[PDB]
mmCIF file of C-alpha atoms and ligand atoms in Angstrom:
data_model
loop_
_atom_site.group_PDB
_atom_site.id
_atom_site.type_symbol
_atom_site.label_atom_id
_atom_site.label_comp_id
_atom_site.label_asym_id
_atom_site.label_seq_id
_atom_site.Cartn_x
_atom_site.Cartn_y
_atom_site.Cartn_z
ATOM 1 C CA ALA A 1 128.215 67.197 76.728
ATOM 2 C CA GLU A 2 126.681 70.684 77.088
ATOM 3 C CA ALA A 3 127.114 71.430 73.612
ATOM 4 C CA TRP A 4 125.636 68.478 72.262
ATOM 5 C CA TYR A 5 122.793 69.039 74.471
ATOM 6 C CA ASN A 6 122.313 72.634 73.576
ATOM 7 C CA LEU A 7 122.323 71.670 69.808
ATOM 8 C CA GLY A 8 119.524 69.132 70.680
ATOM 9 C CA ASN A 9 117.496 71.964 72.361
ATOM 10 C CA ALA A 10 118.031 74.097 69.449
ATOM 11 C CA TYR A 11 116.773 71.473 66.942
ATOM 12 C CA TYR A 12 113.679 70.776 69.459
ATOM 13 C CA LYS A 13 113.021 74.626 69.443
ATOM 14 C CA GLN A 14 112.666 74.226 65.576
ATOM 15 C CA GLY A 15 110.479 71.351 65.994
ATOM 16 C CA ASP A 16 112.939 68.900 64.619
ATOM 17 C CA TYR A 17 112.352 66.289 67.300
ATOM 18 C CA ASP A 18 114.308 63.259 65.504
ATOM 19 C CA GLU A 19 117.377 65.554 65.102
ATOM 20 C CA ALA A 20 116.887 66.621 68.688
ATOM 21 C CA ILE A 21 116.800 62.939 69.877
ATOM 22 C CA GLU A 22 120.179 62.182 67.949
ATOM 23 C CA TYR A 23 121.832 65.103 69.564
ATOM 24 C CA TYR A 24 120.358 64.404 73.193
ATOM 25 C CA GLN A 25 121.664 60.928 73.021
ATOM 26 C CA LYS A 26 125.177 61.802 71.728
ATOM 27 C CA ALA A 27 125.023 64.321 75.075
ATOM 28 C CA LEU A 28 124.082 61.376 77.341
ATOM 29 C CA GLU A 29 126.823 59.093 75.784
ATOM 30 C CA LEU A 30 129.134 61.471 77.315
ATOM 31 C CA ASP A 31 127.362 62.471 80.431
ATOM 32 C CA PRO A 32 124.515 59.903 81.505
ATOM 33 C CA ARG A 33 123.884 61.640 85.029
ATOM 34 C CA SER A 34 122.217 64.764 83.471
ATOM 35 C CA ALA A 35 118.568 64.571 84.481
ATOM 36 C CA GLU A 36 117.840 67.569 82.023
ATOM 37 C CA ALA A 37 119.183 65.651 79.172
ATOM 38 C CA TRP A 38 116.780 62.686 79.801
ATOM 39 C CA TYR A 39 113.981 64.802 80.415
ATOM 40 C CA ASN A 40 114.639 66.697 77.387
ATOM 41 C CA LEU A 41 114.999 63.355 75.468
ATOM 42 C CA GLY A 42 111.597 62.429 76.811
ATOM 43 C CA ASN A 43 109.835 65.592 75.535
ATOM 44 C CA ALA A 44 111.340 65.059 72.061
ATOM 45 C CA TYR A 45 109.743 61.453 72.061
ATOM 46 C CA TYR A 46 106.600 62.834 73.493
ATOM 47 C CA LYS A 47 106.359 65.706 70.631
ATOM 48 C CA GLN A 48 106.928 62.552 68.201
ATOM 49 C CA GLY A 49 103.988 60.917 69.508
ATOM 50 C CA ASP A 50 106.150 58.184 71.044
ATOM 51 C CA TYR A 51 104.812 57.986 74.580
ATOM 52 C CA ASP A 52 106.287 54.733 75.639
ATOM 53 C CA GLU A 53 110.071 55.698 74.897
ATOM 54 C CA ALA A 54 109.266 59.134 76.487
ATOM 55 C CA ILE A 55 107.860 57.226 79.650
ATOM 56 C CA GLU A 56 111.173 55.260 79.445
ATOM 57 C CA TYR A 57 113.438 58.535 79.606
ATOM 58 C CA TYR A 58 111.358 60.535 82.036
ATOM 59 C CA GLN A 59 111.728 57.546 84.254
ATOM 60 C CA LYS A 60 115.721 57.902 84.071
ATOM 61 C CA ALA A 61 115.218 61.827 84.725
ATOM 62 C CA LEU A 62 113.287 61.060 87.742
ATOM 63 C CA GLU A 63 115.485 58.461 88.961
ATOM 64 C CA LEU A 64 118.342 61.218 88.859
ATOM 65 C CA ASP A 65 116.045 64.052 90.187
ATOM 66 C CA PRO A 66 112.845 62.962 91.952
ATOM 67 C CA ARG A 67 111.762 66.237 92.932
ATOM 68 C CA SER A 68 111.042 67.565 89.642
ATOM 69 C CA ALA A 69 107.327 68.320 89.493
ATOM 70 C CA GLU A 70 107.382 69.143 85.837
ATOM 71 C CA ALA A 71 108.811 65.720 85.179
ATOM 72 C CA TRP A 72 106.326 63.794 87.055
ATOM 73 C CA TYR A 73 103.462 65.803 85.423
ATOM 74 C CA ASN A 74 104.923 65.148 82.008
ATOM 75 C CA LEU A 75 105.148 61.366 82.815
ATOM 76 C CA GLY A 76 101.663 61.429 83.984
ATOM 77 C CA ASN A 77 100.796 63.403 80.442
ATOM 78 C CA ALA A 78 102.492 60.193 78.589
ATOM 79 C CA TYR A 79 100.807 57.714 80.381
ATOM 80 C CA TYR A 80 97.356 59.816 79.691
ATOM 81 C CA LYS A 81 98.219 59.922 76.044
ATOM 82 C CA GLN A 82 98.353 56.368 75.607
ATOM 83 C CA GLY A 83 95.067 55.586 77.509
ATOM 84 C CA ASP A 84 96.539 54.458 80.853
ATOM 85 C CA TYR A 85 94.609 56.859 83.022
ATOM 86 C CA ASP A 86 95.127 55.012 86.306
ATOM 87 C CA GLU A 87 99.065 55.506 85.750
ATOM 88 C CA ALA A 88 98.575 59.097 84.697
ATOM 89 C CA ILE A 89 96.633 59.499 88.011
ATOM 90 C CA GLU A 90 99.622 58.323 90.184
ATOM 91 C CA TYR A 91 102.032 60.576 88.703
ATOM 92 C CA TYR A 92 99.933 63.644 88.468
ATOM 93 C CA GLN A 93 99.484 62.894 92.489
ATOM 94 C CA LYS A 94 103.036 62.815 92.567
ATOM 95 C CA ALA A 95 103.339 66.300 90.702
ATOM 96 C CA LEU A 96 100.815 67.692 93.275
ATOM 97 C CA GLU A 97 102.760 66.461 96.157
ATOM 98 C CA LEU A 98 105.598 68.732 94.796
ATOM 99 C CA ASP A 99 103.457 71.783 93.520
ATOM 100 C CA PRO A 100 99.938 71.715 94.785
ATOM 101 C CA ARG A 101 99.474 74.806 92.844
ATOM 102 C CA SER A 102 99.766 73.374 89.304
ATOM 103 C CA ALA A 103 96.307 73.940 87.740
ATOM 104 C CA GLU A 104 97.540 71.779 84.862
ATOM 105 C CA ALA A 105 97.951 69.067 87.087
ATOM 106 C CA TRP A 106 94.658 69.259 89.100
ATOM 107 C CA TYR A 107 92.976 69.701 85.720
ATOM 108 C CA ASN A 108 94.655 66.745 84.043
ATOM 109 C CA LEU A 109 93.952 64.670 87.094
ATOM 110 C CA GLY A 110 90.325 65.640 86.664
ATOM 111 C CA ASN A 111 90.426 64.446 82.936
ATOM 112 C CA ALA A 112 91.916 61.272 83.809
ATOM 113 C CA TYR A 113 89.139 60.391 86.258
ATOM 114 C CA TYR A 114 86.642 61.751 83.696
ATOM 115 C CA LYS A 115 88.214 59.353 81.142
ATOM 116 C CA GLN A 116 87.284 56.413 83.424
ATOM 117 C CA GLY A 117 83.630 57.828 84.034
ATOM 118 C CA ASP A 118 84.510 58.995 87.695
ATOM 119 C CA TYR A 119 82.365 62.251 87.482
ATOM 120 C CA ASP A 120 82.587 63.271 91.108
ATOM 121 C CA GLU A 121 86.229 62.706 91.353
ATOM 122 C CA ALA A 122 86.583 64.691 88.108
ATOM 123 C CA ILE A 123 84.432 67.636 89.633
ATOM 124 C CA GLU A 124 86.455 67.793 92.846
ATOM 125 C CA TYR A 125 89.520 68.031 90.895
ATOM 126 C CA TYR A 126 88.335 70.378 87.974
ATOM 127 C CA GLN A 127 86.999 72.782 90.726
ATOM 128 C CA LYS A 128 90.669 72.847 92.461
ATOM 129 C CA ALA A 129 92.022 73.703 88.894
ATOM 130 C CA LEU A 130 89.358 76.561 88.363
ATOM 131 C CA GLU A 131 90.187 78.082 92.062
ATOM 132 C CA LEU A 132 93.901 78.288 90.870
ATOM 133 C CA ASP A 133 93.173 79.947 87.457
ATOM 134 C CA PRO A 134 89.527 80.703 86.571
ATOM 135 C CA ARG A 135 90.328 81.816 83.154
ATOM 136 C CA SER A 136 90.501 78.079 81.522
ATOM 137 C CA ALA B 1 86.932 78.206 79.193
ATOM 138 C CA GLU B 2 87.937 74.658 78.332
ATOM 139 C CA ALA B 3 88.123 73.933 81.970
ATOM 140 C CA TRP B 4 84.728 75.627 82.968
ATOM 141 C CA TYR B 5 83.397 73.433 79.923
ATOM 142 C CA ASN B 6 84.512 70.269 81.084
ATOM 143 C CA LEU B 7 83.447 70.613 84.640
ATOM 144 C CA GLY B 8 80.056 71.512 82.985
ATOM 145 C CA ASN B 9 80.491 68.070 80.981
ATOM 146 C CA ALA B 10 81.253 66.202 84.236
ATOM 147 C CA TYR B 11 77.839 67.661 85.943
ATOM 148 C CA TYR B 12 75.989 66.735 82.836
ATOM 149 C CA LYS B 13 77.142 63.203 83.009
ATOM 150 C CA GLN B 14 76.093 62.893 86.631
ATOM 151 C CA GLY B 15 72.907 64.105 85.467
ATOM 152 C CA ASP B 16 73.268 67.456 87.271
ATOM 153 C CA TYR B 17 71.902 69.843 84.432
ATOM 154 C CA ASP B 18 71.180 72.881 86.570
ATOM 155 C CA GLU B 19 74.986 72.537 87.578
ATOM 156 C CA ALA B 20 76.066 71.899 84.180
ATOM 157 C CA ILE B 21 74.237 74.884 82.716
ATOM 158 C CA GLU B 22 75.953 77.345 85.165
ATOM 159 C CA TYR B 23 79.312 76.060 84.117
ATOM 160 C CA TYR B 24 78.632 76.025 80.345
ATOM 161 C CA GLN B 25 77.320 79.627 80.847
ATOM 162 C CA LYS B 26 80.769 80.497 82.440
ATOM 163 C CA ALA B 27 82.671 78.761 79.569
ATOM 164 C CA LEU B 28 80.608 80.721 77.013
ATOM 165 C CA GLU B 29 81.341 84.034 78.858
ATOM 166 C CA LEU B 30 85.022 83.364 78.186
ATOM 167 C CA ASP B 31 84.522 82.056 74.684
ATOM 168 C CA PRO B 32 81.243 82.562 73.146
ATOM 169 C CA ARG B 33 82.522 81.120 69.607
ATOM 170 C CA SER B 34 82.646 77.255 71.138
ATOM 171 C CA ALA B 35 79.965 75.784 69.020
ATOM 172 C CA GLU B 36 80.300 72.533 71.316
ATOM 173 C CA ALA B 37 79.618 74.589 74.478
ATOM 174 C CA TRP B 38 76.532 76.061 72.868
ATOM 175 C CA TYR B 39 75.427 72.642 71.672
ATOM 176 C CA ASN B 40 76.000 70.991 75.280
ATOM 177 C CA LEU B 41 74.045 73.975 76.947
ATOM 178 C CA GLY B 42 71.311 73.097 74.723
ATOM 179 C CA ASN B 43 71.452 69.576 75.569
ATOM 180 C CA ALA B 44 71.459 70.263 79.178
ATOM 181 C CA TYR B 45 68.287 72.311 79.031
ATOM 182 C CA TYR B 46 66.637 69.545 76.776
ATOM 183 C CA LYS B 47 67.361 67.047 79.465
ATOM 184 C CA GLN B 48 65.627 69.623 81.885
ATOM 185 C CA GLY B 49 62.620 69.749 79.946
ATOM 186 C CA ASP B 50 63.237 73.229 78.862
ATOM 187 C CA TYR B 51 62.808 72.956 74.988
ATOM 188 C CA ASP B 52 62.366 76.315 73.954
ATOM 189 C CA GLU B 53 65.733 77.347 75.725
ATOM 190 C CA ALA B 54 67.300 74.154 74.174
ATOM 191 C CA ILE B 55 66.265 75.212 70.540
ATOM 192 C CA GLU B 56 67.920 78.831 71.045
ATOM 193 C CA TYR B 57 71.228 77.326 72.064
ATOM 194 C CA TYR B 58 71.001 74.615 69.204
ATOM 195 C CA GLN B 59 70.472 77.610 66.836
ATOM 196 C CA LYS B 60 73.639 79.505 68.129
ATOM 197 C CA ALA B 61 75.822 76.129 67.878
ATOM 198 C CA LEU B 62 74.372 75.665 64.438
ATOM 199 C CA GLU B 63 75.291 79.338 63.304
ATOM 200 C CA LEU B 64 78.560 78.550 64.423
ATOM 201 C CA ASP B 65 78.810 75.023 62.772
ATOM 202 C CA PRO B 66 76.131 74.309 60.182
ATOM 203 C CA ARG B 67 77.619 71.051 59.373
ATOM 204 C CA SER B 68 76.526 69.358 62.703
ATOM 205 C CA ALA B 69 74.263 66.526 61.696
ATOM 206 C CA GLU B 70 73.581 65.725 65.303
ATOM 207 C CA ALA B 71 72.855 69.428 66.281
ATOM 208 C CA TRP B 72 70.052 69.580 63.590
ATOM 209 C CA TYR B 73 68.791 66.326 64.707
ATOM 210 C CA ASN B 74 68.523 67.556 68.290
ATOM 211 C CA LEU B 75 66.792 70.833 67.085
ATOM 212 C CA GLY B 76 64.361 68.538 65.623
ATOM 213 C CA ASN B 77 63.763 66.685 68.672
ATOM 214 C CA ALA B 78 63.327 69.688 70.721
ATOM 215 C CA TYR B 79 60.767 71.043 68.315
ATOM 216 C CA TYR B 80 59.093 67.355 68.578
ATOM 217 C CA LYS B 81 58.882 67.499 72.084
ATOM 218 C CA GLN B 82 56.982 70.742 72.227
ATOM 219 C CA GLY B 83 54.646 69.346 69.523
ATOM 220 C CA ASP B 84 55.821 71.570 66.691
ATOM 221 C CA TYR B 85 55.951 68.740 64.407
ATOM 222 C CA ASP B 86 56.231 70.554 61.094
ATOM 223 C CA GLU B 87 59.338 72.408 62.427
ATOM 224 C CA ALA B 88 60.826 68.942 63.630
ATOM 225 C CA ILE B 89 60.415 67.837 60.163
ATOM 226 C CA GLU B 90 62.257 70.515 58.595
ATOM 227 C CA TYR B 91 65.128 70.075 60.911
ATOM 228 C CA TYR B 92 65.133 66.225 60.519
ATOM 229 C CA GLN B 93 65.517 66.885 56.790
ATOM 230 C CA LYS B 94 68.548 68.898 57.451
ATOM 231 C CA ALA B 95 70.178 66.376 59.161
ATOM 232 C CA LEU B 96 69.444 63.867 56.782
ATOM 233 C CA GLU B 97 71.147 65.864 54.021
ATOM 234 C CA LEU B 98 74.375 65.596 56.101
ATOM 235 C CA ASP B 99 73.786 62.080 57.131
ATOM 236 C CA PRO B 100 71.470 60.104 55.209
ATOM 237 C CA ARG B 101 72.266 56.884 57.068
ATOM 238 C CA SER B 102 70.827 58.141 60.561
ATOM 239 C CA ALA B 103 68.136 55.444 61.089
ATOM 240 C CA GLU B 104 67.117 57.749 64.168
ATOM 241 C CA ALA B 105 66.494 60.841 61.968
ATOM 242 C CA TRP B 106 64.465 58.767 59.643
ATOM 243 C CA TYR B 107 62.511 57.178 62.359
ATOM 244 C CA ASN B 108 61.831 60.659 63.976
ATOM 245 C CA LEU B 109 60.997 62.132 60.588
ATOM 246 C CA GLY B 110 58.312 59.392 60.319
ATOM 247 C CA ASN B 111 57.075 59.920 64.003
ATOM 248 C CA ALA B 112 56.593 63.450 62.913
ATOM 249 C CA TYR B 113 54.267 62.766 59.973
ATOM 250 C CA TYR B 114 52.697 60.017 62.027
ATOM 251 C CA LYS B 115 51.724 62.879 64.743
ATOM 252 C CA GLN B 116 49.966 64.951 61.989
ATOM 253 C CA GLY B 117 47.918 61.749 60.902
ATOM 254 C CA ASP B 118 50.211 61.495 57.591
ATOM 255 C CA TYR B 119 50.505 57.698 57.441
ATOM 256 C CA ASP B 120 51.705 57.320 53.994
ATOM 257 C CA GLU B 121 54.600 59.565 54.847
ATOM 258 C CA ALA B 122 55.163 57.981 57.877
ATOM 259 C CA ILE B 123 55.520 54.487 56.173
ATOM 260 C CA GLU B 124 57.948 55.850 53.480
ATOM 261 C CA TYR B 125 60.072 57.089 56.433
ATOM 262 C CA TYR B 126 59.933 54.084 58.910
ATOM 263 C CA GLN B 127 60.783 51.761 56.079
ATOM 264 C CA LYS B 128 63.915 53.816 55.334
ATOM 265 C CA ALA B 129 64.776 53.660 59.048
ATOM 266 C CA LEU B 130 64.294 49.956 59.261
ATOM 267 C CA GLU B 131 66.405 49.280 55.911
ATOM 268 C CA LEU B 132 69.205 50.949 57.898
ATOM 269 C CA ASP B 133 68.760 49.160 61.121
ATOM 270 C CA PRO B 134 66.104 46.349 61.206
ATOM 271 C CA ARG B 135 66.643 45.783 65.107
ATOM 272 C CA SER B 136 64.323 48.548 66.498
HETATM 273 SM SM1 LIG C 201 113.826 65.673 61.011
HETATM 274 SM SM1 LIG C 202 107.422 52.961 71.165
HETATM 275 SM SM1 LIG C 203 83.544 58.535 92.335
HETATM 276 SM SM1 LIG C 204 71.207 70.346 90.771
HETATM 277 SM SM1 LIG C 205 61.155 78.076 78.591
HETATM 278 SM SM1 LIG C 206 50.089 61.772 52.578
#
């Protein structure tokens, strides 16, 4: 399992996401309880621009490990990429429950309100991002 | 940079142009090569009725990206707002080099001749606008 998984990671790192996906699937055939493999499978789809598939596999990682801030954040990002801004918000809010110091997460929460023409909410959250990291 | 810039855009969208300007300046402190930030800074001044300042920042955006039709057009508009009709013309002509299908640009070129009592030139260009968009 671990060996297929790391082959996957190595392809993922080369930017070969179809090949990463193949190998993560192998790994998960052998051990369907590794959160990290589902999560990485999700990211591989994300990097292919397959946001709906990415969302499906982030959900499985999160079912296995609900305290992953980054998984919730990346779930948000997938919904954001498909234009589902209200769902992006929900999942950014869950990332910020776990890590209220993610500037990324506040910033993207801001964006997700901006995209709906909610400027005051967007300002609030951009200001939180910038307080955390004023170099953006 | 991007984060200050988007805070700016969010205030700009609320109609808070002084606050937009403050934040675009921040953004530009950090990255003085973003055309879009100079251009937006220009628009923020424009919306305040600070046409000379708007012109200064449109020039900088255009120095960075000379193929922006909208920037040339908005440059025109700033000069037009201050009564400098001959300069408006020059910059409308540059917008129309890039996008000869801007009805807006032909129409305002027309206006800028009208304002100088050049009625035949104004007619020519109003007719071009109306051919492109006869709903005005
Ligand atoms: Sm391949
Ligand atoms: Sm799909
Ligand atoms: Sm609101
Ligand atoms: Sm104000
Ligand atoms: Sm002035
Ligand atoms: Sm004449």
